[PDB]
Each structure stands twice: as structure tokens, then as C-alpha cells.
Short mmCIF file of C-alpha atoms and ligand atoms in Angstrom, two decimals:
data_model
loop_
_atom_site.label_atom_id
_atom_site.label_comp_id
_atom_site.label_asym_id
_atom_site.label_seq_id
_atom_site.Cartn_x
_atom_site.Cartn_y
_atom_site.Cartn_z
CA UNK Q 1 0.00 0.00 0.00
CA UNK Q 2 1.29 3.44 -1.00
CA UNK Q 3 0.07 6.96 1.17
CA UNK Q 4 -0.38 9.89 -0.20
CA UNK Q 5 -0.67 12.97 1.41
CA UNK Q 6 -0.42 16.81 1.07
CA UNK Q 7 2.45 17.93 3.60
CA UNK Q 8 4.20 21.48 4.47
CA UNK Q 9 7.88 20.74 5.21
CA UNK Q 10 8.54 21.68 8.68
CA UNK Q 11 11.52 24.64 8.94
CA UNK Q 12 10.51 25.18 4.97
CA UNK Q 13 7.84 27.84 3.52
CA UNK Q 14 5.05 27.55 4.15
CA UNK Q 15 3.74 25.59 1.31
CA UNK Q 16 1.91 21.90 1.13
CA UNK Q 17 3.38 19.44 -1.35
CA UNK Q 18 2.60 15.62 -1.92
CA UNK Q 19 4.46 12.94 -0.19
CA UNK Q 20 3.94 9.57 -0.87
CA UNK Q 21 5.29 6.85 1.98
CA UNK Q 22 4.92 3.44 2.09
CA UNK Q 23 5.51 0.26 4.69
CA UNK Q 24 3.27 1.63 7.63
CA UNK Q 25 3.91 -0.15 10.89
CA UNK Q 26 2.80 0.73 14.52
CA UNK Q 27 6.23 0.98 16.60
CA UNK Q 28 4.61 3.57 19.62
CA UNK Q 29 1.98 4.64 21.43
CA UNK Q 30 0.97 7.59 24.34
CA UNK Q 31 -1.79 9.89 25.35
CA UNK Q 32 -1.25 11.66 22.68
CA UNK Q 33 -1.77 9.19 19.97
CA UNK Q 34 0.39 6.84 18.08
CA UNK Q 35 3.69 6.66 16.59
CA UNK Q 36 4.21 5.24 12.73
CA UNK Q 37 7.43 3.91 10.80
CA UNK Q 38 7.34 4.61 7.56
CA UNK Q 39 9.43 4.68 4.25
CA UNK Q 40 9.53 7.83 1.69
CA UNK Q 41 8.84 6.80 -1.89
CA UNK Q 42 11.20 9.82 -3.02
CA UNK Q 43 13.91 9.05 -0.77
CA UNK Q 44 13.18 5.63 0.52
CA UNK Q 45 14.62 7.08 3.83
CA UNK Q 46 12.86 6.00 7.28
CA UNK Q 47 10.91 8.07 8.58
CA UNK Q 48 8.61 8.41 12.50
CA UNK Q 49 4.96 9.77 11.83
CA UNK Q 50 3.64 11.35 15.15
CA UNK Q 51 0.09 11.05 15.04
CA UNK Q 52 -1.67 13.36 17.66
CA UNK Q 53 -5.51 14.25 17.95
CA UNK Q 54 -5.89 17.66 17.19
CA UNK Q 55 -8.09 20.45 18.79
CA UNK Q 56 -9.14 22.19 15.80
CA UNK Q 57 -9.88 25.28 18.23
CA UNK Q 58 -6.37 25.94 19.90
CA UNK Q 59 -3.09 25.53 18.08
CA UNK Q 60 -0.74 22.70 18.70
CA UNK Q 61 2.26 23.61 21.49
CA UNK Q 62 4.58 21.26 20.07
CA UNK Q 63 4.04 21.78 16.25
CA UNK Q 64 5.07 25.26 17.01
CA UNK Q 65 7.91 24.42 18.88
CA UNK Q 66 9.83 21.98 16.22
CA UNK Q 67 9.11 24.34 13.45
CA UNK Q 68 11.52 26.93 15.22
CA UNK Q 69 14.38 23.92 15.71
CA UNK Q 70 17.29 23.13 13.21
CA UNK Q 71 20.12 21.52 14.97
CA UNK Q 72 21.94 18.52 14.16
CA UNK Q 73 21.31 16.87 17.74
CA UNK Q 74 17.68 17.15 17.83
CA UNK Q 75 15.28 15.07 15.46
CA UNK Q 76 14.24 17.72 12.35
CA UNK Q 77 10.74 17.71 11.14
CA UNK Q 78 10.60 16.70 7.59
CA UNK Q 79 6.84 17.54 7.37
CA UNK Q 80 3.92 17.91 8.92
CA UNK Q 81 0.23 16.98 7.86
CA UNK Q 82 -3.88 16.41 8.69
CA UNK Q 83 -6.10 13.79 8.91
CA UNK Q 84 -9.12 12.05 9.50
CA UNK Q 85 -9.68 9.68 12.87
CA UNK Q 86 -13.00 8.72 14.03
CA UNK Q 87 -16.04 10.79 14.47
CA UNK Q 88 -16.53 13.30 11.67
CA UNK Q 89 -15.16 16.36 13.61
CA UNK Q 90 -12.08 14.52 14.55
CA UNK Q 91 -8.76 15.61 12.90
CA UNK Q 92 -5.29 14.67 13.36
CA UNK Q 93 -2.00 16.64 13.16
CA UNK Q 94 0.59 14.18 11.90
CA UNK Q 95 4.10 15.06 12.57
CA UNK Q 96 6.98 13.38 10.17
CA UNK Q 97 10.08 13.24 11.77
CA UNK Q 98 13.87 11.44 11.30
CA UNK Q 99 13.88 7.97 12.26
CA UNK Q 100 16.59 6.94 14.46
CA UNK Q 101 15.63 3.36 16.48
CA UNK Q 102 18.37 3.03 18.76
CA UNK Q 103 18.13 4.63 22.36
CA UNK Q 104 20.73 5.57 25.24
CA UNK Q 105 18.49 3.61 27.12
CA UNK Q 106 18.24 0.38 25.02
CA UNK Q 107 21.73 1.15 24.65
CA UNK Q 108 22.33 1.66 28.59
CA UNK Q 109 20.27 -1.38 29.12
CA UNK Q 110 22.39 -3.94 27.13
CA UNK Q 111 25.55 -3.04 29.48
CA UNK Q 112 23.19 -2.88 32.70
CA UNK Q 113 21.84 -6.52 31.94
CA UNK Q 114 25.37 -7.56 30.81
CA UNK Q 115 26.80 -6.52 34.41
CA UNK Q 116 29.07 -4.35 31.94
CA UNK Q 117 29.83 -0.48 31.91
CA UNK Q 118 29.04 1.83 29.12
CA UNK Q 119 32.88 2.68 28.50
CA UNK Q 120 33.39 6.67 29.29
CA UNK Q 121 33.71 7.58 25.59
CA UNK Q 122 30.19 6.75 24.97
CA UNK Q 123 29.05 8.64 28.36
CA UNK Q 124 31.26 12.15 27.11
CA UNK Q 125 29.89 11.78 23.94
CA UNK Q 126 26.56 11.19 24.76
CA UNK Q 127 26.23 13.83 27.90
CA UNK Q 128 28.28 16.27 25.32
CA UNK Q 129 25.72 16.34 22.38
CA UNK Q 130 22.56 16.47 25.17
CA UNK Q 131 23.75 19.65 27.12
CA UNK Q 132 24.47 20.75 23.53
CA UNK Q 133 21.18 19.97 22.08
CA UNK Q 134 19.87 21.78 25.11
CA UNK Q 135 22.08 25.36 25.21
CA UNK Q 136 20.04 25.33 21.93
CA UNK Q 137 16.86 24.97 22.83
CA UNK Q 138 17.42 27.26 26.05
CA UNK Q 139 18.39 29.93 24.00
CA UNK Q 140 14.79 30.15 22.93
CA UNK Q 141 13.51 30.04 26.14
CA UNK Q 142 12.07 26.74 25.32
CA UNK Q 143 12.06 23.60 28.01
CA UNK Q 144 11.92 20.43 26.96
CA UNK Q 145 10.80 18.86 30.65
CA UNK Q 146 10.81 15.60 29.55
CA UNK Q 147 14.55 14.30 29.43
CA UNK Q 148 15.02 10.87 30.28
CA UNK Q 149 17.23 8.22 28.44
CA UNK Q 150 13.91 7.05 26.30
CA UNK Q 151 13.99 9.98 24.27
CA UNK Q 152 17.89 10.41 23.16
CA UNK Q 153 18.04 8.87 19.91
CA UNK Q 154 21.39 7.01 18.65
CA UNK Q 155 22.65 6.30 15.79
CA UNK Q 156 24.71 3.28 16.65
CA UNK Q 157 27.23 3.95 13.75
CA UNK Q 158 28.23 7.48 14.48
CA UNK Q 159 27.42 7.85 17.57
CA UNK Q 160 25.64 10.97 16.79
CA UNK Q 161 22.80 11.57 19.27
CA UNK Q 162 19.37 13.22 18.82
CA UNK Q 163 16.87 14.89 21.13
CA UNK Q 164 12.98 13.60 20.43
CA UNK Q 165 9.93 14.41 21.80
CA UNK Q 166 9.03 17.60 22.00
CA UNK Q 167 5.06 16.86 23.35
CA UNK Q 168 5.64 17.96 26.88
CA UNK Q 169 8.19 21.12 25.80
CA UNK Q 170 7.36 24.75 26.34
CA UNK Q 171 8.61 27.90 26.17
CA UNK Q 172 9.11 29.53 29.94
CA UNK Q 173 7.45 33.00 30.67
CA UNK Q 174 9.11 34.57 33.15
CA UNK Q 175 5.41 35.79 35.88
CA UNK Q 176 3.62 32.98 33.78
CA UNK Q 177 2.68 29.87 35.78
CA UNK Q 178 3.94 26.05 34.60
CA UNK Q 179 2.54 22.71 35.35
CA UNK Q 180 4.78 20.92 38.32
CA UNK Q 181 3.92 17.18 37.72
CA UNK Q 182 6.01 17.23 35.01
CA UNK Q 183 9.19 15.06 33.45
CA UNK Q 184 9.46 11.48 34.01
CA UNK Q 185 9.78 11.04 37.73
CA UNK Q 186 13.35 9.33 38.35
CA UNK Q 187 14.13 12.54 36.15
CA UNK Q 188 12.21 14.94 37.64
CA UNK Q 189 13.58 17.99 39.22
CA UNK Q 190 13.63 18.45 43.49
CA UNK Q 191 11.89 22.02 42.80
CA UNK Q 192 9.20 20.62 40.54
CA UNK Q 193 8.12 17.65 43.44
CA UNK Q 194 7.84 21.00 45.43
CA UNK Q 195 5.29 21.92 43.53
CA UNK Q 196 6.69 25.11 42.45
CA UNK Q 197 5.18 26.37 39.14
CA UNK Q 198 7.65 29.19 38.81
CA UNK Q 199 10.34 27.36 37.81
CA UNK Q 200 13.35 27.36 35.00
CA UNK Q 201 14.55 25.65 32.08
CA UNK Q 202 17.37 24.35 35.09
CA UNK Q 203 14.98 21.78 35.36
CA UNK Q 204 16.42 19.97 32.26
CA UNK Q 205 19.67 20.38 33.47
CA UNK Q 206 18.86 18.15 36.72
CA UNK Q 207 17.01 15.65 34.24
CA UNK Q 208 20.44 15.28 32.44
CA UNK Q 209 22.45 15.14 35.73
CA UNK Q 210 19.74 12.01 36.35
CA UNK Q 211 21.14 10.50 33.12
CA UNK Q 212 24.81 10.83 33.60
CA UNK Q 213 24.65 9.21 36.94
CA UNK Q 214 22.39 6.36 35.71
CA UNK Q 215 25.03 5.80 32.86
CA UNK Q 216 27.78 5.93 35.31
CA UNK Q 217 25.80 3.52 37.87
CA UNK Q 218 24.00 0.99 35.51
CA UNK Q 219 20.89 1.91 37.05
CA UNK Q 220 18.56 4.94 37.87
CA UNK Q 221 20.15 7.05 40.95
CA UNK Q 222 16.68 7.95 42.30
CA UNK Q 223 14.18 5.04 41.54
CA UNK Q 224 11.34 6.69 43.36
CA UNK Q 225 8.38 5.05 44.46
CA UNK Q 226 5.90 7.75 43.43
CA UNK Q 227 5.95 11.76 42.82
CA UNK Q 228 6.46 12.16 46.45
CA UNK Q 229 8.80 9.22 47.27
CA UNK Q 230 10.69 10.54 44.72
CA UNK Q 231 12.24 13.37 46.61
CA UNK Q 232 13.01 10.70 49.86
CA UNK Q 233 15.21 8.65 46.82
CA UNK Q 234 17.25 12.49 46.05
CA UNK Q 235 17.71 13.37 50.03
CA UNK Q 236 19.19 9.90 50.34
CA UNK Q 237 22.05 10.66 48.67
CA UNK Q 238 22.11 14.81 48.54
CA UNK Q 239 20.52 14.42 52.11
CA UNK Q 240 18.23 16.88 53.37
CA UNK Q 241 18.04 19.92 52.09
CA UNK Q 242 18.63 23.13 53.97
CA UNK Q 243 15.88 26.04 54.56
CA UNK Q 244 17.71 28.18 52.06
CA UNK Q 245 17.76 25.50 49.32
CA UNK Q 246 13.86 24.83 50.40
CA UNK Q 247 13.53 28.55 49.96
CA UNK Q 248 15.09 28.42 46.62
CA UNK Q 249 13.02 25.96 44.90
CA UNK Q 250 9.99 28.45 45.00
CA UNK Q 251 8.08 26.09 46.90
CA UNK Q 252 3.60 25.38 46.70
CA UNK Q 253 3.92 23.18 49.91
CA UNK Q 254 6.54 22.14 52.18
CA UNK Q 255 5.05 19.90 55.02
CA UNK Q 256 6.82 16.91 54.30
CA UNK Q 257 7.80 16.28 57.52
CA UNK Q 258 10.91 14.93 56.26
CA UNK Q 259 13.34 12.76 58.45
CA UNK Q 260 16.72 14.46 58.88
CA UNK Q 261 19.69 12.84 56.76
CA UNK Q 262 23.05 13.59 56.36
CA UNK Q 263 24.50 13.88 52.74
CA UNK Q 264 26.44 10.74 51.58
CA UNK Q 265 29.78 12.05 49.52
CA UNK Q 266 29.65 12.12 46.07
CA UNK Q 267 32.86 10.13 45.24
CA UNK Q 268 30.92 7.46 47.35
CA UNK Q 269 27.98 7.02 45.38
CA UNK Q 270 30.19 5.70 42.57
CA UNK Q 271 32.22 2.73 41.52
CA UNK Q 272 35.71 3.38 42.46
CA UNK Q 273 36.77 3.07 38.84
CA UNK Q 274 34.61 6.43 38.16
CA UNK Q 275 36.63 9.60 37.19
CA UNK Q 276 36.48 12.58 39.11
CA UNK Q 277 35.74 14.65 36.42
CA UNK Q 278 32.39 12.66 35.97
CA UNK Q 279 31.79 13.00 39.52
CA UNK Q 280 32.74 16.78 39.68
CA UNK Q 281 30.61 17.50 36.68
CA UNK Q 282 27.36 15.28 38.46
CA UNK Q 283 27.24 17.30 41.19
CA UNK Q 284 27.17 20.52 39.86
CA UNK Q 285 24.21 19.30 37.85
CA UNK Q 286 22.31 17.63 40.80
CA UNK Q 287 22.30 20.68 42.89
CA UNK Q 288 18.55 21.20 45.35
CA UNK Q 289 19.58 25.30 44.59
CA UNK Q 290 18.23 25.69 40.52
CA UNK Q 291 20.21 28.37 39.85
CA UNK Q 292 23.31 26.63 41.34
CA UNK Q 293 23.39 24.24 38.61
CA UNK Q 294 25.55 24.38 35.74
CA UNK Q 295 23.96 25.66 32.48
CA UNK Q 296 24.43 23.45 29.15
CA UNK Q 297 26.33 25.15 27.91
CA UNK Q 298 29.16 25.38 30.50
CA UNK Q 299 28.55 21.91 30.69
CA UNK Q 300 29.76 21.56 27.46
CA UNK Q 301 32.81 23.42 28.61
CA UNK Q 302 33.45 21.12 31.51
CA UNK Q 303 36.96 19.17 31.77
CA UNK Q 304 35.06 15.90 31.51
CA UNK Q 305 34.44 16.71 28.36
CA UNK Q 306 38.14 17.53 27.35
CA UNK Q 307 39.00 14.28 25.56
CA UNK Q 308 36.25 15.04 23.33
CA UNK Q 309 38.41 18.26 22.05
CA UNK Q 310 41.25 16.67 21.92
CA UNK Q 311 42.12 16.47 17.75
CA UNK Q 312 43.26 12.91 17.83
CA UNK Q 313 40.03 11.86 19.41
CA UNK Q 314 38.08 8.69 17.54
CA UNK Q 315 35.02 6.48 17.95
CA UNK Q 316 35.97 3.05 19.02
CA UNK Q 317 34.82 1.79 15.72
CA UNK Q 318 37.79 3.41 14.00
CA UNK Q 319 35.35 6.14 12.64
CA UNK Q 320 35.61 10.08 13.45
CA UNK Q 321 33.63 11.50 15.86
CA UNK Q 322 30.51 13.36 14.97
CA UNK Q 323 30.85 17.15 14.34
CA UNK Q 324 30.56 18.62 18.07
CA UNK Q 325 32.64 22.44 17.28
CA UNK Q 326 30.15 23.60 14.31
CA UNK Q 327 28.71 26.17 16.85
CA UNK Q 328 26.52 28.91 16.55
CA UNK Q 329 26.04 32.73 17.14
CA UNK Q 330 22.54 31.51 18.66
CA UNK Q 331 23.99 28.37 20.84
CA UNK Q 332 26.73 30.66 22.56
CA UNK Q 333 24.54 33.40 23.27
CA UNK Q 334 23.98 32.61 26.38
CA UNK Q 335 27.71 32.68 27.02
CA UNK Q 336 30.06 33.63 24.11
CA UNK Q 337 33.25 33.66 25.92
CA UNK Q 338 32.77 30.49 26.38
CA UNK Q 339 33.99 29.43 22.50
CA UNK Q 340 37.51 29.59 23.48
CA UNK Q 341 37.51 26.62 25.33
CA UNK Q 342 34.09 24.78 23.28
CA UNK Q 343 35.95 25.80 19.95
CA UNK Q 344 39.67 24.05 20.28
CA UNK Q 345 42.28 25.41 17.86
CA UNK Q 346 42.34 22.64 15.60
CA UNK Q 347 38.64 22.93 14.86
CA UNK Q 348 39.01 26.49 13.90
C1 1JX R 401 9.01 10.44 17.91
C2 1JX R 401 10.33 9.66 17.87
N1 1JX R 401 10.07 8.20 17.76
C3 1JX R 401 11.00 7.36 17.16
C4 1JX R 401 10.99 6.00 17.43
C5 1JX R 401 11.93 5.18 16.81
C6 1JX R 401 12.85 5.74 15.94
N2 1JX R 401 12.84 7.12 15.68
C7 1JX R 401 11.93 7.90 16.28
N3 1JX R 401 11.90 9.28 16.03
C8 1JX R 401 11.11 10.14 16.81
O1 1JX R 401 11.13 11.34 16.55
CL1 CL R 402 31.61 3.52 17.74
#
């Protein structure tokens, strides 16, 4: 069976063309809809097709949002396109989008299962094109609030990574009020299980803090029992946090009633073998005090990093590492200084 359909590209013009695609198959699913693989009859490239009921009424948050993007660690929209469901007044936005199968987690769950270690290289490079794909998004103003190891796409051959899923993203209005039960929970921000709803795109930054540490460990670092339990998992390890840090966080409630725990050292929570520089770098990410965290973009800068800059770095597969210098006027904006030490001389 061959589909045709009348699609606007997504950074393009704004002008519908036909697209024809081909071998449909159901690979996910969500409250939002349902996920399609597909193959282009132009291109016979892969492709995801996001399929999300549509409120004819209001316009669709996330459609917005990935028309802005262009970056090459973040899944591009190809296209974008409508459709009929059920009832008659149903109609479906369908988003078209790169199609990358692999997934840190799948990946991270091969090594877990194994009783293995993802080897450092993959961690840097990994951690390095995230807070990457993130200074971009920032710079925008736009949150993703859903990182978690299930949405960083791989491509297993050059190890370039990808950031998916834009359906719970948002740009951040500084006096406007956001949502707190947000992110996936083992990622989910100390601030947020406060229940503040004046919060920052920091938030992200803890999220990818929760994925470094999982990579490092083989496991989640705060498998939490529910929303709430959640934050007893964090003060296990950052133990509990002080009035100021509680006062930080831009707390809705605060009677917890939380037992008192002391904080249990960083270099202790990892294998011996771990590096320091992983370790420094984790704990200026998992900070209770949002703006204490680093932002992505000095993440990027971090020594853990270095390797990565180094010019006779290379994939274990022989291959050359993806591009990770091409920066932009818009990613450094936040920080421009900064290039001297993300731009290495070589790559200049
Ligand atoms: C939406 C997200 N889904 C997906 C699943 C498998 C492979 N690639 C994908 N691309 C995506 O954007
Ligand atoms: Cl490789």
C-alpha cells in the first residue's frame, strides 16, 4: 500500500506538497496518539509519523515548537500533515520526523543486563551532544521537561545523538505559571516535586544530571516510588536539604515532615573506577539550589568533556567523531566567551 498525502515541510515555507510513503507499521503509542514507521517513496529514507488528535480550536504547542528547531542533535521535522480519525469532527496533526531506532536507554540497558559499563567515551559523547542539544533549545527560552534516556536517539554507527519528543516542551514566561507534575519522575527535578510552578529551564539540566549518573551507575540514581517518594530517593544521597535550598526551589507546599539525613559524599555514590571529572561534573548538575546548577552550555565546557576536544580523538569503531565544534552565534549566546575553550584550535 502506497500513502499519499499533502504535507508542508517543517523549517521550509510555508507551502503543502505531496508525499507519498509506504511500509506503515505501529512501533509507539501515548496519550497523545500513536507513533508510525514509515518509508519515503522519493527518498526511501525511514521516517517516525507522530500522530496526535488535534483540537481544531487551539493551536498545537509542540508543532510550534519543532518548526523553530534546526540543529543537528535534535530530530528535524521533515513535514507535517492532517487527517481524519473517528467521528466526523475529529482531525489529526501528523508530525513526520527522522527515524533513528536506537536509544541511550536500550543502549544503557544492554551493558546494565550484561553486568558491563558503558565505557566513558560513549558517556562524554553522549552527555556532550545532550547539554548541547539543550544550550540550543534554552536559547529560545524553550524547556523540553521531559529528558530521560527514552527519548535520546542514537545512531549506533556514528554515535551521533538526537533529542525527540518535543510533546511535553514549552517555552518559559518569566510571571507565567507552569505545570509541576512534570518530566518522568526518576528525572524529575527536586523544585518541581515542590510543587513550584515558577520554575526554569534548570529543570532539564537536573534531568540530564539524572542521566549521567544512571550511565555511570547501571541503574537509575533515584528510583522513586511515586511523585512524592521521589524526593526521599534524592535526600538519600544529597541528604536533606537546607531552609535556604527549600527557599530556593519556590516552593507550593513544604510539610513533608521529612526525616533528617546527612548527605552521603559524592565520590561514594560511585564505583571506584569512576573519574572525578564525571563526579565533579554530576554534582554541579544535581544541585537542590536551581540556579546553582551548571547551564548546558558550560557543561559543554566542563573538563570531563576535554578528551572530546582533543584532535586525535576517535570512535571506538575506527570512525571520526561526529561534528561537536560547528557552533553557533545563537547556541553561545547565552555565554560567548565560552567558544575559546568549546571551539579548540584545531577545529578552527
Ligand atoms: C518520535 C520519535 N520516535 C521514534 C521511534 C523510533 C525511531 N525514531 C523515532 N523518532 C522520533 O522522533
Ligand atoms: Cl563507535
Amino acid at each position: 500500500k502506497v500513502t499519499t498525502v499533502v504535507a508542508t515541510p517543517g523549517q521550509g515555507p510555508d507551502r503543502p506538497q505531496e508525499v507519498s510513503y509506504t511500509d506503515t507499521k505501529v512501533i509507539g503509542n501515548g496519550s497523545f496518539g500513536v507513533v508510525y514507521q514509515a518509508k519515503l517513496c522519493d527518498s526511501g529514507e525511514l521516517v517516525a509519523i507522530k500522530k496526535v488528535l488535534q483540537d481544531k480550536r487551539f493551536k498545537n504547542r509542540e508543532l510550534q515548537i519543532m518548526r523553530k528547531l534546526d540543529h543537528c542533535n535534535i530530530v528535524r521535522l521533515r513535514y507535517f500533515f492532517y487527517s481524519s480519525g473517528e467521528k466526523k469532527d475529529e482531525v489529526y496533526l501528523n508530525l513526520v520526523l527522522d527515524y533513528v531506532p536506537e536509544t541511550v536507554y536500550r543502549v544503557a540497558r544492554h551493558y546494565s543486563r550484561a553486568k558491563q559499563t558503558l565505557p566513558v567515551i560513549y558517556v562524554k559523547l553522549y552527555m556532550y551532544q545532550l547539554f548541547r542539544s539543550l544550550a540550543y533549545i534554552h536559547s529560545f527560552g524553550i524547556c523540553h521537561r521531559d529528558i530521560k534516556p527514552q527519548n535520546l536517539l542514537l545512531d549506533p554507527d556514528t554515535a551521533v545523538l538526537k533529542l525527540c519528543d518535543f510533546g511535553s516542551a514549552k517555552q518559559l514566561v518569566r510571571g507565567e505559571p507552569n505545570v509541576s507534575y512534570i518530566c518522568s519522575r526518576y528525572y524529575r527535578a527536586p523544585e518541581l516535586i515542590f510543587g513550584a510552578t515558577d520554575y526554569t529551564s534548570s529543570i532539564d539540566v537536573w534531568s540530564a544530571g539524572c542521566v549521567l549518573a544512571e550511565l555511570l551507575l547501571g541503574q537509575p540514581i533515584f528510583p522513586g516510588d511515586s511523585g512524592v517518594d521521589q524526593l526521599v530517593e534524592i535526600i538519600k544521597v544529597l541528604g536533606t536539604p537546607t531552609r535556604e535550598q527549600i527557599r530556593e526551589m519556590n516552593p507550593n507546599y513544604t510539610e513533608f515532615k521529612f526525616p533528617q539525613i546527612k548527605a552521603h559524599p559524592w565520590t561514594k555514590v560511585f564505583r571506584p573506577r569512576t573519574p572525578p571529572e564525571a563526579i565533579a561534573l554530576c554534582s554541579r548538575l544535581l544541585e537542590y539550589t536551581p540556579t546553582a546548577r551548571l547551564t548546558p552550555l558550560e557543561a559543554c565546557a566542563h573538563s570531563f568533556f576535554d578528551e572530546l576536544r582533543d584532535p586525535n580523538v576517535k570512535l571506538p569503531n575506527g570512525r571520526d567523531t561526529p561534528a561537536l565544534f560547528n557552533f553557533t552565534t545563537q547556541e553561545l549566546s547565552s555565554n560567548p566567551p565560552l567558544a575559546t575553550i568549546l571551539i579548540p584550535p584545531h577545529a578552527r
